[PDB]
Design a protein around this ligand. Structure first.
Ligand code: GTP
Length: 406
C-alpha cells in the first residue's frame, strides 16, 4: 500500500553516495509526503517533472586559463576526444561539444591575462550566465588575476575550481633530480600549499593537482567527486554520463545514476501488488533492445569500443566477449529457465528495500531487466580496466551482478 511504497522509495535512495543522488532530499521528502497522504497523482507529477529535468538538463563548463596551461588537452580529456580526431581542441570563447552527449559543451575561454577586462567585465564578455561552473587552470602558480576572477565568480553565486595541471612532469623531473630522496607527497604538498596560500590572499579555495594525460591519477578523481557534489541533484545524471569509463569510481557513478533513473521511471509507471509474469519476457527484452544498446554505449561495451581492448590483449573481440557476462545475460544456463531465475531475482531485489514484514512493492518486469543489465554492464566495464591480470587466473572475468546468481 501507500506506506509500503513510500518506505521502499526511501530505502532505495538511502543506498547511494550523497554526491551521486539525482534527486534532492526535498524532492524525496515531497514525494514521500504525497505518497503517504494518498496524493498519488501529485507524487507521479513530481516524478514526471524531475525526470523531464534530468533528461533535458544542459551542461555548460567554462575552462579558463592562460596559454601553455594544458587547457586544450584538459578540454579534450574531459570529453574523451583524442588529440587527432574531429572536434579536438588545437580573443573569443570557443565551444567544444561532447562527442556523445548533445546537451554537453566544454567552452575554451581566453585567459583574463591575455585581455584588458576587469574581472566583472571579463565575466560579462564571456557570458558567465550560460555556464554551470568554471575551471581555472594553470600549469605553474596562479596569478592574482585568477584569485580576482574567482572572487568575481563567487560574488555572482557560482562555483569555481582551481586545477593545477602537468603535475606528472614536475614529479618526473624531481624524481630524476633527486632519486635517493624523492618524496612524491612532499612535492605535491609544496605545490598545493603555494597555490592555496597565495590564492587565499585575495579570497580557502579547492585546488586540484592533475595530470591531463591520466584522469585516474592524482586529484582528478577527487575533482570529479567534488564537481558532482556541488552540482544541483538533477544535473548529476548528465554529468555522470559525461565522465570517462576509466576508473572503478567513475563506472560506478554511471551505474548508480542510471539505476536511480530507471527506478524513478518504474515509480512513474506505478507500483504493482504482485510479481509480474514472465510469459512475454522475450517480447519485453525486444522492446528494451535500443535501451540495452544505449547502456552498452555508456559503459564502452559497444562492439566498436571493444576493438581497442581486444587488440591490446592480442585476441579477437569475439574471444574476448566469451569472458564477459552481458552477451549471454538473458540466455538459459544450467537448464534453468530465465523466468524462474527472474522470479528469484525479483524477490531478492524487493526484500532489500522492503524487509520481511511490510507489504512488498513490485514494479514492471522491464525495471528488473534494466537494473540487471546495468549492474552487469558496469561489472563488465570494471573487469575491462584490469583484463590482463584477470585473464591469467580467473569463465567470466567480471563479478556477477548483485542477486542474480544463487
Ligand atoms: N605529461 C603531461 N603532458 C601534458 C599535460 N597537459 C598537456 N600536456 C602535453 O602538452 C602538450 C600541449 O601543451 P600546451 O600547449 O601547454 O597545452 P595545450 O593542451 O596545447 O593547451 P593550451 O593551454 O592552449 O596551450 C601536448 O603534448 C600534451 O600532451 C599534462 O598534464 N601532463
Amino acid at each position: 500500500g501507500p506506506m509500503a511504497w513510500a518506505s521502499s522509495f526511501d530505502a532505495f535512495f538511502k543506498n547511494f553516495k550523497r554526491e551521486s543522488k539525482i534527486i534532492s532530499e526535498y524532492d524525496i521528502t515531497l514525494i514521500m509526503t504525497y505518497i503517504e497522504e494518498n496524493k498519488l497523482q501529485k507524487a507521479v507529477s513530481v516524478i514526471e517533472k524531475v525526470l523531464r529535468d534530468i533528461e533535458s538538463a544542459p551542461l555548460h563548463i567554462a575552462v579558463t586559463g592562460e596559454t601553455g596551461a594544458g587547457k586544450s588537452t584538459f578540454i579534450n580529456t574531459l570529453r574523451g576526444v583524442g588529440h587527432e580526431e574531429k572536434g579536438a581542441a588545437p580573443m573569443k570563447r570557443t565551444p567544444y561539444p561532447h562527442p556523445k552527449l548533445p546537451n554537453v559543451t566544454i567552452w575554451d575561454l581566453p585567459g583574463i591575462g591575455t585581455t584588458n577586462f576587469t574581472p566583472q567585465n571579463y565575466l560579462t564578455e564571456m557570458k558567465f550566465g550560460e555556464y554551470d561552473f568554471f575551471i581555472i587552470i594553470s600549469a605553474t602558480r596562479f596569478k592574482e588575476n585568477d584569485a580576482q576572477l574567482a572572487k568575481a565568480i563567487a560574488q555572482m553565486g557560482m562555483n569555481f575550481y582551481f586545477v593545477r595541471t602537468k603535475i606528472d612532469s614536475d614529479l618526473d623531473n624531481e624524481q630524476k633530480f633527486k632519486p635517493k630522496s624523492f618524496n612524491k607527497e612532499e612535492v605535491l604538498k609544496n605545490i598545493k600549499d603555494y597555490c592555496s596560500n597565495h590564492l587565499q590572499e585575495s579570497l580557502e579555495p579547492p585546488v586540484f593537482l592533475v595530470s591531463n594525460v591520466d584522469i585516474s591519477k592524482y586529484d582528478f578523481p577527487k575533482l570529479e567527486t567534488k564537481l558532482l557534489q556541488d552540482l544541483p541533484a538533477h544535473k548529476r545524471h548528465v554529468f555522470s554520463l559525461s565522465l570517462q569509463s576509466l576508473t572503478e569510481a567513475t563506472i560506478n557513478y554511471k551505474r548508480d545514476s542510471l539505476k536511480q533513473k530507471v527506478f524513478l521511471e518504474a515509480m512513474k509507471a506505478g507500483a504493482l501488488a504482485t510479481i509480474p509474469l514472465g510469459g512475454m519476457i522475450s517480447d519485453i527484452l525486444e522492446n528494451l533492445d535500443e535501451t540495452f544498446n544505449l547502456y552498452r554505449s555508456y559503459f564502452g561495451l559497444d562492439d566498436a569500443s571493444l576493438e581497442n581492448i581486444a587488440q591490446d590483449l592480442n585476441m579477437s573481440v569475439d574471444d574476448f566477449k566469451v569472458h564477459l557476462r552481458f552477451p549471454h545475460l538473458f540466455a538459459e544456463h544450467n537448464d534453468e529457465s530465465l523466468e524462474d531465475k527472474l522470479f528469484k531475482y525479483i524477490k531478492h531485489i524487493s526484500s532489500v528495500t522492503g524487509g520481511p514484514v511490510a507489504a512488498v512493492t513490485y514494479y514492471r518486469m522491464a525495471y528488473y531487466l534494466q537494473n540487471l543489465f546495468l549492474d552487469t554492464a558496469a561489472n563488465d566495464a570494471i573487469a575491462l580496466l584490469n583484463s590482463k591480470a584477470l585473464f591469467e587466473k580467473k569463465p567470466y572475468i567480471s563479478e556477477p551482478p548483485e542477486y542474480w546468481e544463487a
